[PDB]
Amino acid sequence: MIRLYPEQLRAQLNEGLRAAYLLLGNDPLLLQESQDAVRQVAAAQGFEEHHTFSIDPNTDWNAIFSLCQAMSLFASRQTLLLLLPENGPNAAINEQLLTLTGLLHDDLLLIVRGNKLSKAQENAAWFTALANRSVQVTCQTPEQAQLPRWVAARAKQLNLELDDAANQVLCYCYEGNLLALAQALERLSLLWPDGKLTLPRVEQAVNDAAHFTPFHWVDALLMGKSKRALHILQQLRLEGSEPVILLRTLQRELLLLVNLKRQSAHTPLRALFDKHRVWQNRRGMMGEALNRLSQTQLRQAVQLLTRTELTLKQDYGQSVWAELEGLSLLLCHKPLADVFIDG
Amino acid sequence: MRWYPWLRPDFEKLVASYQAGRGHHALLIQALPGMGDDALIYALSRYLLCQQPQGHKSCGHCRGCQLMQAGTHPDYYTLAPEKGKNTLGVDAVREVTEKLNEHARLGGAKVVWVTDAALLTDAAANALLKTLEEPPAETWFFLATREPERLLATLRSRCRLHYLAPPPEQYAVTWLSREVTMSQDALLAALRLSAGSPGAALALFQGDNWQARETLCQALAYSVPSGDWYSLLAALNHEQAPARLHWLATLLMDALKRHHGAAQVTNVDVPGLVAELANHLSPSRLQAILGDVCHIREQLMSVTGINRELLITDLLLRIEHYLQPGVVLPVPHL
Amino acid sequence: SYQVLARKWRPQTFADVVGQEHVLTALANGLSLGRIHHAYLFSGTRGVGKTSIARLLAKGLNCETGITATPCGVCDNCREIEQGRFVDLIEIDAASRTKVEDTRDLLDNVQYAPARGRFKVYLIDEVHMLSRHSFNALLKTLEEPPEHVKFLLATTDPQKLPVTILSRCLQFHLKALDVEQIRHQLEHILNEEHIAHEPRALQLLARAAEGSLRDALSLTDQAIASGDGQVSTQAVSAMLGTLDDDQALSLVEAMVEANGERVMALINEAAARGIEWEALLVEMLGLLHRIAMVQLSPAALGNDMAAIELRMRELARTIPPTDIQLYYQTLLIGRKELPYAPDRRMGVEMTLLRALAFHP
Amino acid sequence: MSYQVLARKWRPQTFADVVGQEHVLTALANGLSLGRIHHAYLFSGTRGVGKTSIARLLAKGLNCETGITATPCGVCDNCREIEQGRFVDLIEIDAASRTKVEDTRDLLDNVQYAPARGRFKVYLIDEVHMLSRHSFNALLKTLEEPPEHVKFLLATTDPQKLPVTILSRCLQFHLKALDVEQIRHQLEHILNEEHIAHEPRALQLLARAAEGSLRDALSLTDQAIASGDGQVSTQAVSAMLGTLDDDQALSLVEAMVEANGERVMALINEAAARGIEWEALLVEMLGLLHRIAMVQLSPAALGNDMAAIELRMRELARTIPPTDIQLYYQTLLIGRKELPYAPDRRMGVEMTLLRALAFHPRMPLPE
Amino acid sequence: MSYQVLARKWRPQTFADVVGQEHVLTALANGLSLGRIHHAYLFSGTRGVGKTSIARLLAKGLNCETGITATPCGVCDNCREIEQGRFVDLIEIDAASRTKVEDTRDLLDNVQYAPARGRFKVYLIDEVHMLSRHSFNALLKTLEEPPEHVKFLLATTDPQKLPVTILSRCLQFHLKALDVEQIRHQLEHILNEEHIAHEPRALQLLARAAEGSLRDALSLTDQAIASGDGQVSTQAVSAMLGTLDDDQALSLVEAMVEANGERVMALINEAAARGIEWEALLVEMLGLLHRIAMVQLSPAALGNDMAAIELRMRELARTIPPTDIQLYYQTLLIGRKELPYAPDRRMGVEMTLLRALAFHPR
DNA sequence: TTTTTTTTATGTACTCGTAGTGTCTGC
DNA sequence: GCAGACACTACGAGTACATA
C-alpha cells in the first residue's frame, strides 16, 4: 500500500482516487482536515452518499447494508466512514472488517479513522487484504521541537505574521493540541484583520488548554525542565488522568535509571545501553540524567515513589498529585524534600 | 488433595459429634495451609450430605456420593475466588445466601463451605453474619482459616472454632521422608519453615520453590560479604514474593537468634550462610533489617494490586542504606 | 437448633436478659408510660445482645394486651415473632440488602397498614453496612415516620453510621458483660440443661469470652463437643491453650536477664508442648502488670501470687519501673502485630527479640 | 394528651421559636419584609440545627393568607396544612428517594402549572446533595430562570458535593451549630412545658453531650426521661452518658500529678465500684489534661459548665509546666492506643497510670 | 412588590453590556460584520461567566431585522421576541434535560424545515456536555453537512467531556474568568443603576469572594441586600462572609505560623460552629503546608489550581524559613496520626495546633 | 520516530437494544 | 380473531462515575 503524509495527501487525491483511504493518527486536526479534503474531492468527482459509521464494540454493525445494494434513485457513488476504537480493532472486529473488505463496489469509497495500529493489528487479515489498493495516511502530532515550523506553515496558510515570540507562546500554550492551535489561529485572524500578530495581542487572545501524555512528563523530569514538568502535572490533573498510569510510567524509567547508575561504575555506557534495550532517541537523555543525579537522589526518589504508591493503594488518599509534584522537585533539579517529602 | 494419617483422630471426633446431632452448624477450622484443611472439610461434607448407612465411612453407591465424586451436587455450595480474582467477592456470598433459603433439591441436608474465610472482604463476612447466626435447619457451614483473629470479630464469634494440632516434628519428618527423598537437615528446615505443617513442606519440594530458595541462599552468600544487597531483586520479585520474603525473614531471625547462642536454629540446612550473616552484621542492624522485611511482607499481602517491583526495590535500597555506617536505624512503633 | 447454644437460648422476657440494667430500665419505663419512640438504636460489641433485645422490644410492642413493659409469653402474636411467622415485623440483614433499590422498596412499603398488631416494626440488623445512598434514603423516613411504624436499628459499631442517623435515634449502648455476669449466666444455663460443670472451668470460659456472651456459649459448646460431653477443667484448659504453670514467669525472668539461649529454649519447649502463643503473651503482660503494681505497694502482690511470691518480689526489687514499662510496651506491640506474622511462633520470637534488646 | 417524641412535637412553628441562627432568621425575615424573594435557597450546616424547619417556616411565610409576611400570622388556613404536612402546594421531595434523573424530569415537566391554592409552589428538596449528577444538570436551567410562581428550597448537610454551577445561582444560607447555652436554655423551656422536674447540672450535661445540634439534644433528653422515672436527674444523666461529672477525673489527675499512687489506685477501685467503662475514664482524663493545656495557653478558656471546678483548674494552670502537660497527654494517648490490647481494660488503665507515674519528670518512682 | 432577582433582570442585551471577555466579543463582531461565520460555535467558560448570555446575544444579532450585524437594533419585533422566551426560529434546547436521543431527534429533524421568520434557524443547545453518545452521533451527522440556513450555538461548562470529533467541527470560544476589578466595576454599575447604597470596601469584599464569576457576585449582592436592611454596609458583608467562610485552612495556618493563640482558638471555634470533618481539615492543612514547602523550592510549584489564594500563599512562602515549615508539617502529621484516638476530634486537633504553636515563638 | 498504559471491591446511574405483554383496531 | 401493530414495560449491557 501507499504510506503517506498529510502534506502530500492533496497530490495523492489529485492524481486519482484509490479504492479506500485509511487515515490514521493520534491528532484530531490533521485527521479532520484529511477527511474533509477526501470528502470534498470525492464530491467533486461524483461521490454524494456519505455515511458516518462508528465501529466501537456496541450494538452498531450493519455497514454491509449500504454496500450490497445499488442506488435506485441515481447512480450516486457512496462514501463509508469507520471510527476505529481507542485501541484499534479486536480479533472479532478484525474478521468483521475482513468480511467488509471481502466485497467492495468500485464506486464505493471507504474511509477509516482511528489511532495508530501496532503490528498486532497491522498483520491482521483485514489490513493485509487492504494492503493492495488502499492508501494509508499517517497524521501525528509534531514534537515540541517540531511545532514552530508547523505553526509557521499554518500562519503562511492564512497569510499571517507572528515573528518568533508569538510562535513560542502559542507552542507552549497549545502544546500537544493542534486542534485548539488551529482554532486559535483562526480566532486571531478574526480578531485582527491586519493579520500582523504580535505578542501584545496573542498574549491575551490565547488559552492554557494543553494536552499531554505521561511520557512527556517523564522526559521533562529527565531533562530537568522544572517548569515544563510542573506544567504537565497540572495539565494532567485538570485532564483527570489516572495517577496510577503516571506512577507506572515514571517507575519504569526510574528503575532503569537506578540499574544504570548501579552498573555505571563498572561498565561503559555504550555496552550498558545495548544490554538494557534502550531506545536510540533516549540514549543522550539517559546520559544526561546519569551524569546529573547520584544514587542518593535516586534512592530518595524511590522511597518517595514507594510512599506515594502505598498511600495510593492503601489509605485511598488524595495527596497523590502534590506528592508527584514533590517527586518532580526531587528528581533531576534540586533535591531537598527533607523528610517533609521524603517519608 | 490427599488424605493424611494425623487427620484421622480429629475427623473421627468431629464426625462422632455430628452423627449425634450435637455438632455446631458453623465450624471454623484453624488448619495451617498444606495441612488437612480441605480434606477434612470434604470428608465431613460428603458424610453429612448423603445417606449414612455405613456409619462414619463413605457409602459410595448412593447418589449423593456419586454427585460428590462428580462434583455436581446442587446442595453442596463452595465459596471460592474466581480464576481472575484473589479475594472472595460479596456477590457470590449474597447469591449463595439467597440460594440457601431454597429447600434442598435432594431432600437431604445442605452444606455451605468456604475455601478460605480469611479471603473474604468485609462486606462478604458481614453478609454471611445473619445466615451464620440463624441458618435454615438443614444447613451446616464450614470455614477454613490460618488465623482466626484476622477474621471479622463478629463472624469469629458466631462460628464454633476447632483447631488442628501440628504433628510432632519427629512424626512429621518420618512421614515426609517416606515419599520425599531429600537430606534430613533440608527436610527438617522445610518442615520448620512451614511451621511444622506437612504438605506445605512437601509442597516446597514438589514444586519449584526449593530451587528458588537455593538460588536465594546463593545470592545472599554472594551479597552479604560485599554489602551489595542489590542483585537480590531478581531472586525476590516473583508471584511467590511473600514466601521468599518469609524465607529471608527466617534467615535473619536465625542469624539474630544464633547471635545470642540459642540452642536450635530455624535454618539448619545452611549453617555457613547464617554464620556469615552473624559475622558481617551488627545485632541492631540485623534486627532492623528483619523488622523492615516483615513489615514490607505484610504490606505485600495486605494491600491489593500493589506493584511489588517498587516495594522490593525500595526495601533493598533501604537495606543497603542501613548497612552503611553512621545511619540511624528505625524504631518499632505503634 | 438441636443442641446449638446461643440459638435455642435466646432471651424471651426482659426478666431473662443478663445485665443491661440501664437499657432494660429505660425500655421498661418507656413502654409502661407513653414515652415511645420511632427509632431505637442498640449499639455494642459482639455477642452482648443486640438482636435479642431488639426482638424482645418488638414482642413487647405488638402484644395483644397492648403496649406492655414485660412481654406476655403465651400468645399468638408473640409466638409468631419467636418462630419467625411474623407479618407486622420486617427483619432485614442490612449487610445483605445493601442495595439502595431494596431500601427504596422498603420505603415504598412503609405506608401500608399492618395486617395484625398495632405497629409495623422494621428490625434492620447490621445497620452500618448499608450503602450511603440507602442511609440517605432512610434519613427522611426516620425523621418523621407514620405513627404506625417504628424502626429498630442494631449495629456492631456506630462509627460507620452517618452522623445524621445517630441524630435521629435513641442510642442505647449495651455495655460488655463482666466476668461475674457471664459466669452466672453460663452456670444457670448448664444447671437448666443438666450438664456436668466445674466452677474453675466455668471461670476460664468466662475469662476467655472477653465480655461477649455469645462467645461464652460457643466456647461451652466447643468444650461439650470435646472432652467427654461434659464441661471439665482439664478439657477446657487443654482446648483453650491456657497455661497453668510457671512457664510465663520463667520466661519473664529469662527475658529480664536477657539470657538468650535460655529464653529461646523456653519458647522451643513451649512449642513442643504446644502452648498457644497469644495466651502466653497475655500472661506475660499480666505478670509485668503485677510487677508494676507491686512497685507501688507490696500488698499489690496478687493475693499471694500463687506460691511464687519471692520470685516476683525479687524481680520487683531488681528492675527499675522504667524498664518494666518498656518491656510492657514492647510485649503489647508484639501482641498487636502477632496476627500479622507468618506464624504465631515466629511473631512471638520477634516480640521477644525486640524486648531483649533494652540492655536486659 | 398522648406522648409523642420531642423532636417532632416541638418543631418550631414560627420565626420567634427558632433559637440561635440569628443571621439566617434576620436575613430571611428582612428579605420577606422588603419583598425581595430569591427563587432558590440553599440551607447548609451540620445535622439538626434547623435547616428543614427553617425552610418549612419560609414556606409558611411565603404562602400565608394575609400576603407575603415575614412573621407567619399565627395559624391561618394556608398554614394549617403546612403544620399538618398535607399542604397542596408545598411539595416535599425526599431527594434521596428520587435521585434518578427520570424523576427530576417529571418534576420539571409540571413546573409551569399554576399553584392550586398558594401563591408559590414551594419545592422543598430535602437532602439536595443526593441527586444524581444528571438530575443536577437537569435542574440547572429551571433554577436559572424559573417561572414567577415557583420557588426552590434546598436543604443539605455538606454543600461541597453539589456542583458549583448550582451553588452559583442560589442563595447560600449557612446555619452554624448552636452554642451550649442555646441548647441548655431551649431544653429548660422544653422540660418546663412538659411539667417535668429537672436538675440544672443534668441539663448542662445534656447540652454538652449533643454537639451543637438540637434534635440530637432532644433525643438524648427523651432517652434520659426514659432512663429516669419520667424525671431528668443528675444521676440518670451521668448513667446514660457514661461521663464522670467534673470531680472524679479531676481527683485522678490531681493525684497523678502529685505522684501519689495510693490515692490513684484507691479511686480506680472506687470507679470500678461505680461500674463505669474504663475507656470513658481515660477519655475524661485526657479531656481534663487538654482543658488544663487550654487554660495555660489562653488565660480565659473555661466555659460555664466547668465553673464548679474552675478554681482547681487554675491551680494546675499555675503549678504544672506545659511540657509536663504535653508529656502526660501523649502518655495517656498511647495508653488509649494500647488499652484494647491489654490483658484487661482495668489492667491496661492501671498500667497506663503507672506508666505516667514512673516517667513523672518531677517525682518519678524510685529505682 | 415583584423585585426581580439581580441574576435575571441584569442579563446583558447588547454586546456593549458584556463585561470583559473582549477576546470573544471582538471576534464575534468581526465575524458577523464580515462574511466569515462558522457553522457551529462552541462556548466555554467557568461557572457563570457569560456563556449563555453571549450565546443569546449572538442569536439576537444573527436574526435582527436590520441584518446580520455586531449590534442588534433592539427595537424590531425579532429583538423584542427573542428578548422574551417566545420565538420560533431560535430554539432553546435544555440539552441537560433532553439528553436521550429520542428527544434530540424530534428537534434535530427541524433543520430540514425552513426558518419561519429570520434568516437563520439558530439552535441554542445549552449544557451540551450532557448528551448521550447516540445523541452526539445524531448531532454530528447533522453538523457534517449542515444546511446553509442553520447555525448551531453550543454552551457548556466542561468542553473536554465532548467527544473529539464533534469538537473538531466547532469554533470554540473559551471565556476567561472575570477579574476582580471588572467584577467590582460591574457591581458598582448594577448597584448605582438601582436604589442600593453601598460602601466601596463592601464591594471589594464581594468581588474578592465572588471567585471571578458575575452570577456568584450578584447572588452574594442580593443576599447582602437582604441581610443588610436595604443598604450594603461593610460590616454586614464581612459578617455574612464570616458565616460563609470556607478557607479556614489558610487563615488558620497564617495564625499558627504567626503564633496568635487567641486567633487559632477563635478560628477553631468558628470551624466548629460549621460542621467540618476534622480529619479533612487537618489533611488539607497538611496539603497547604506541603505546597508551601514546594514553593520554597521553586516559584513555579504553585500552579493554576490556587490562583484565588496565590498572593497570600506566596507571602507565606516568602516570609517563613523552610525549616519551620518542615517542623510544622512533622508535628501536624504526627498529630493527625494520633487524631482519631484523642478525646474528641475537635479536642485532638486543638492540642495538635497547640503543640505546633508552642515551638519557635513563645 | 516509538512503543510504550493501571489497583479493587462495591455500589449507583443512564442510555440504548431487544423481548414479553396488552390491547385495539381495521383487520 | 387475530395477528399485528404498535405501545409499553422490563432487562442486559455498555459505560461513567463515586467511595473507600
Ligand SMILES: Nc1ncnc2c1ncn2[C@@H]1O[C@H](COP(=O)(O)OP(=O)(O)O)[C@@H](O)[C@H]1O
Ligand atoms: N444479655 C443477654 N442475655 C442472654 N443471652 C444473651 C445476651 N446477650 C447475648 N446473649 C446470647 O447471645 C446470642 C446472640 O445474641 P444477640 O442478641 O444476637 O447479640 P447481638 O447484639 O450481637 O446481635 C443470644 O442467642 C443469646 O444466647
Ligand SMILES: Nc1ncnc2c1ncn2[C@@H]1O[C@H](COP(=O)(O)OP(=O)(O)O)[C@@H](O)[C@H]1O
Ligand atoms: N434552630 C432551632 N430551633 C429550635 N429547634 C430546633 C432548631 N434546630 C433543630 N431543632 C429541633 O430539631 C428538630 C428537627 O430539626 P430539623 O430542622 O429537622 O434539623 P435538620 O436541619 O437536620 O433537618 C426540630 O423539631 C426542633 O425541635
Ligand SMILES: Nc1ncnc2c1ncn2[C@@H]1O[C@H](COP(=O)(O)OP(=O)(O)O)[C@@H](O)[C@H]1O
Ligand atoms: N459579561 C457579562 N456581563 C454582564 N453580566 C454578566 C456577564 N456574565 C455573567 N453575567 C451575569 O450573570 C448572570 C447569568 O449569566 P449567564 O450568562 O447565564 O452565565 P453562563 O455563562 O454560566 O450561562 C447574568 O444574568 C448576568 O447578570
Ligand code: BEF
Ligand atoms: F453479633 Be451482634 F449483632 F453484634
Ligand code: BEF
Ligand atoms: F435534616 Be437533619 F440532618 F436531621
Ligand code: BEF
Ligand atoms: F449558566 Be452557566 F454555564 F453557569
Ligand SMILES: [Mg+2]
Ligand atoms: Mg445481630
Ligand SMILES: [Mg+2]
Ligand atoms: Mg431534614
Ligand SMILES: [Mg+2]
Ligand atoms: Mg449557562
Ligand SMILES: [Zn+2]
Ligand atoms: Zn453416600
Ligand SMILES: [Zn+2]
Ligand atoms: Zn404476647
Ligand SMILES: [Zn+2]
Ligand atoms: Zn399563616
Ligand SMILES: [Zn+2]
Ligand atoms: Zn432588531
